[PDB]
Amino acid sequence: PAFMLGSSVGNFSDGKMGRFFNHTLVLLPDGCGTLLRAFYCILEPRSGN
Amino acid sequence: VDVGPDSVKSACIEVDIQQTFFDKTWPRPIDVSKADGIIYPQGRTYSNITITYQGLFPYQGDHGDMYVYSAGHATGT
Amino acid sequence: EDGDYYRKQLSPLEGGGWLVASGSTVAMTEQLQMGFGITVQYGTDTNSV
Numbered sequence A: 001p002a003f004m005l006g007s008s009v010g011n012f013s014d015g016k017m018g019r020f021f022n023h024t025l026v027l028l029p030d031g032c033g034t035l036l037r038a039f040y041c042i043l044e045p046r047s048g049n
Numbered sequence B: 001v002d003v004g005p006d007s008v009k010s011a012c013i014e015v016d017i018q019q020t021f022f023d024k025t026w027p028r029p030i031d032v033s034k035a036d037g038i039i040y041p042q043g044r045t046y047s048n049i050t051i052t053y054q055g056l057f058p059y060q061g062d063h064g065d066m067y068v069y070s071a072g073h074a075t076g077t
Numbered sequence C: 001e002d003g004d005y006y007r008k009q010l011s012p013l014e015g016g017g018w019l020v021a022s023g024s025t026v027a028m029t030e031q032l033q034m035g036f037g038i039t040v041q042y043g044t045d046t047n048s049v
Ligand SMILES: *[C@@H]1O[C@H](CO)[C@@H](O[C@@H]2O[C@H](CO)[C@@H](O)[C@H](O)[C@H]2NC(C)=O)[C@H](O)[C@H]1NC(C)=O
Pocket: B048
């Protein structure tokens, strides 16, 4: 699974909760079950469809 | 202080919200006597002996936050 | 500047309201000084420092 962890919590534009804020972390599995790419960086929401 | 690419144009694949199908059950609580996911003493080891320890644990018999993933819609290929 | 007041509105997920702070400033000494705190850890891991 993938876990994203932070301190700030915010709600989305439509009002549902979910945004977060400042420095945060997420881990990502890949390699069909071998690759654990882990970081604590900063997100940047994209504004497309 | 890092480097890494970016993927595509800003057009996300269409995600739905269909938790109603995902809200099924497979009840499996935890068991410390089955040693179900408990941290080992991180500092030192022992042998063939029984010791108390103050540590971070779950409550015994909790039902947890079970989730599951699944594939999306598809037609043929 | 000194005496600055910081205030940010909070969400009901942390209880709403505002987080506030008050801050003051100190200028230089001639020889600029640094504070260091040192704390060792005894038996948590491999004794290797
Ligand atoms: C691990 O501990 C157990 C519990 O004491 C040991 O088993 C006993 O060993 C004594 C040694 O003479 C026997 O008299 C007892 O009959 C044993 N108990 C049982 C229930 O059989 C065991 O020997 C220990 N293991 C090691 C490798 O030291």
